[PDB]
Amino acid sequence: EQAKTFLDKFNHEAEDLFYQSSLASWNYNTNITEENVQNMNNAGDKWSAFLKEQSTLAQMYPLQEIQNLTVKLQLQALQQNGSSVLSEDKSKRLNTILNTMSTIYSTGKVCNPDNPQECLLLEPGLNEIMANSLDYNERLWAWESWRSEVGKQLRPLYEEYVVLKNEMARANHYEDYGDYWRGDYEVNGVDGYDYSRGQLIEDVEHTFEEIKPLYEHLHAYVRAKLMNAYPSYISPIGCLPAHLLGDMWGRFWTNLYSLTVPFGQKPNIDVTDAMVDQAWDAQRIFKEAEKFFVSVGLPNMTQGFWENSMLTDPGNVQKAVCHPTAWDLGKGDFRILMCTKVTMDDFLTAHHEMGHIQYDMAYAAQPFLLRNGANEGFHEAVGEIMSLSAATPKHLKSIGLLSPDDNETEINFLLKQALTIVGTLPFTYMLEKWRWMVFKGEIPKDQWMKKWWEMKREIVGVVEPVPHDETYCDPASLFHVSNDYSFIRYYTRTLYQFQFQEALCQAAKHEGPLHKCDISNSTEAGQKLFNMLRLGKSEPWTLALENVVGAKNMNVRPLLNYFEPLFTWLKDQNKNSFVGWSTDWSPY
Amino acid sequence: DIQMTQSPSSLSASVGDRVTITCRASSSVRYMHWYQQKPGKAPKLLIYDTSKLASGVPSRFSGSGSGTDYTLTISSLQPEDFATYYCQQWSYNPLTFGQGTKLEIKRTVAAPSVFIFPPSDEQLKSGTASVVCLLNNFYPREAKVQWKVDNALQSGNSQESVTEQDSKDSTYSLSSTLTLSKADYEKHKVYACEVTHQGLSSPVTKSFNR
Amino acid sequence: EVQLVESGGGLVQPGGSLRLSCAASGFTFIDYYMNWVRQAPGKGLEWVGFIRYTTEYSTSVKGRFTISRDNSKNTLYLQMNSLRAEDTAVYYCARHMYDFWGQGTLVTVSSASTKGPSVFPLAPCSRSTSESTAALGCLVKDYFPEPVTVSWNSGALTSGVHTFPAVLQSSGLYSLSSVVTVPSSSLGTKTYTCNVDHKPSNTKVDKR
Ligand SMILES: [Zn+2]
């Protein structure tokens, strides 16, 4: 009990320093400039030295028989640590690398070849082509031009990135830098509920087998209906071209709904047309997300949030990171970097990013060292639970995006969700599995892009329109890789997403298909989540899960029950198409 | 409760020597804390944590310990290190100290300068008589101070006071007072006081005639 | 500076009450433990109590004492509701943590009343045997509360001054000597004044 005194001075300094470092990072994303690079470096160095200091000191106070478990947990947390991890050169090299990879990704220009001084950025320009353009010549130009003029310059940086990130993990007693990320799910010392760093992989590969029947039929359907949009460009057997999948990385098949509508004469379930018709501003999207959490039983957003956050693009002169970002700066300051588009895409992303904050606001009741969320997938699942509910045809009617009103409609909606959700399950499995095999030293630099196209064709079912030399770095052309971030969260997320929704649909008293369920004007479901939302790291994710759902592990069963009507339907419609894919088709 | 006790309950040592004080705790092996108390002044922290000198404490001091046995040592004992030394627990719910250790500083044996004072004018009008003898600047403390009135030893009605060692000389000063009624003082003439001490070739006596 | 300043009463009757206090500055008050220790004249050091804001006491005093904070005045208090003659000691305040001491205040518990001293100067008859130096002095007698102050030549002379501990007489009253060691060549030339303050009785005396 004697060291509860120490933790107060830790929390006092940690909150000043954590906020100091976190705000300097916010300044940078909002205003990319040397004003904020050097501030983000310095505040990061000081915050990091404090952590290695305070962990050294916590290790001077061993833990046993402390009854006020608040102290036991804050100590166990300090015990997880960074210890003498890097020399000044290697800290400053990784700083320079990630102050460059994040800059190149967010500022990277692509010159239009017919005028060498005319340029276009990813946000929103090049992604406008990849998302909405239906011109193969043009979609192909945007797709590679990014990976060539930007993705090539990112390779030797990620190359050094891999070297030094992997040395870090071993210094803190890890297997590899992928193991460092995989350790987020570890539950250790608990008798009835535990989880190893390696069990993450066993569970991912195991449950991923139950996706393939649903994904392969979705693949074949998208193939057959892309062929009606890109006539002579797509094989009826092979893998889909990457640049035709709705975005620059082939991640979300959401934008293919425009081309894959199961029942086109139904009133449009994608309400982007209505949101533009009603002249929705960026705030109205978030206002109409704030209201949903209120109907759950949750508080309004803070006045700091509404006058700090950058929810739109700045002027073109002001260079900025625009990927949806939710911040807990500590000390009560909550911010979001949406750079919102008037669309159902960012509409349902608003509920996602706002779900991050509501989770942050909830577990702010716990001490500093517990304010992280149960694990990666939990911090993401909170947002998806809400957007899944906000997106139902019923809920969209009530909002005012659909005018007053079917088996055909239910499929018409359910495909759109599978395009967004299911399309990213194999993309996510592919991405981190590649990164882990690089971190584990299994894929040499001789075979980086080799193994990347290998896995694109075999696992995802997607091909390169032009075979790429090792010069390219295709994974780093994505935000989550370029800006150091983990991706396996999105696989675990989706399985968590439907476990929780099944439990909440009992609390909200649904009596029906999970497909049609939303959480609105239901204190029962809000109280149910909020009981868990406050916990943070106070409980292992294994129990935070079991205290809401009946399961003590990531589980794929309720995911499939959300989509079972679409699966039965896709089996019917794909008798006229090949279902699998050829490992070796190449439009080249 | 937890207790502790120091092995040298008292310690005499010479100037410049290599000295050591030891404290044995009852039940634990913990970061022990030491203090040096000069007499008549507040205890001053010596070793903040075992083997870490408290700020302001010079290089002459050093601490160490393991088990229940924690120690304090001085490289070259200075004359100014006369004190009583204590140990503090810092470890459990019942905070405690132990048997303290008093340190006395050895020096070349020195004989006292002997003075005697008659009772004052006001005191004789008041009704009693206090005959005072001083032993100034001497070592060791040990001495016998005996009152004689007309060569008769006076037993009882005599009291003594001892100063702490002068931190520079390591010497003592000692007073002795004989309390008489005025009548008994008036009844006699020869008031003397005799001192026996190592530094004396023979006992010494000072006196006055009433 | 790091500073603890202590104050409180002196002589109090057995079975009575008295509150001590200490002020603190140079540091944040609430970042530290505040403790009372206790040193009976002929004993080692005791722990009296502790305050984080928990409050704990040694077994000897919990039934009699209470420790209090005012963390806006930056002060520590010790309230002694029931006093025993056993509780007679010098009380110190201290700053402890995960040290600095104020100087102790003497609380004396006994029934007898304050009296105040009588000062009786001392000087030898002219004697050239005690010639390398000659001693002058003054005796303070029969004062019950132990605090007493002796200065010489209005606090000037300190080079040769020695002051003895107070002793307890049969009368139950305290008395002490005091001495200045002077060159024997200055006895009749320079003045040497015994300056005595006994604050508990408000007695000021100045004699030669
Ligand atoms: Zn997210």
Residue numbers in the entry:
A (entry chain A): 23 to 427, 431 to 613
B (entry chain L): 1 to 210
C (entry chain H): 1 to 52, 58 to 103, 108 to 217
From the paper:
To mediate receptor recognition and membrane fusion, the spike (S) glycoprotein of SARS-CoV-2 binds to angiotensin-converting enzyme-2 (ACE2) on host cells, which has previously been proven to be the membrane-anchored receptor for both human respiratory coronavirus NL63 (HCoV-NL63) and SARSr-CoV (SARS-related coronavirus). The physiological role of ACE2 is to act as a carboxypeptidase that potently degrades angiotensin II to angiotensin-(1–7)21. Here, we isolate and humanize an angiotensin-converting enzyme-2 (ACE2)-blocking monoclonal antibody (MAb), named h11B11, which exhibits potent inhibitory activity against SARS-CoV and circulating global SARS-CoV-2 lineages. Analysis of the structures of the h11B11/ACE2 and receptor-binding domain (RBD)/ACE2 complexes shows hindrance and epitope competition of the MAb and RBD for the receptor.
